[PDB]
Amino acid sequence: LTAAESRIRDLDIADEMAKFTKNQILAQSNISMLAQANSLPQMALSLLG
Amino acid sequence: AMYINTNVPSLTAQRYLGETNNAVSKSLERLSSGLRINSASDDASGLAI
């Protein structure tokens, strides 16, 4: 029974670590794209004027 | 021939600028999202699969 119950304790840590790494990598790309999205259009309009 | 209020090249430039801005917006959305299809209109057959 203690073998049976220790099957919903935690996953093999490798996949959790991989998910953590993937999300951490994606966050920085999101940040950079947000920065350039802020920068581009208003400055383009100001160049027009 | 020199006229007044015949700025056709301005209209042409405005049109081309409009299409360029639309393309920039779509590319930024795609790369920020990190997905190919998104929405429901990019591909009509991949969604069900």
Angstrom distance (rounded) from CA B28 to CA B30: 5
Q: Do B31 and A37 form a contact (C-beta atoms < 8 A)?
A: no
Experimental structure resolution, Å: 4.1
Chain A residues within 8 A of B28 when measuring between CB atoms: 33, 36-37
Return the closest-CA partner of residue B33 out of B25, B23, B41: B25
B32: which chain A residues are within 8 Å (Cβ-Cβ)?
30, 33-34, 37
B47 close to B40: Cβ distance less than 8 angstroms: yes
If you ran DSSP here, which 8-state letter would residue B40 be given?
S
Integer Cα distance of A16 and A3 in angstroms: 22
Method by which the coordinates were obtained: cryo-EM
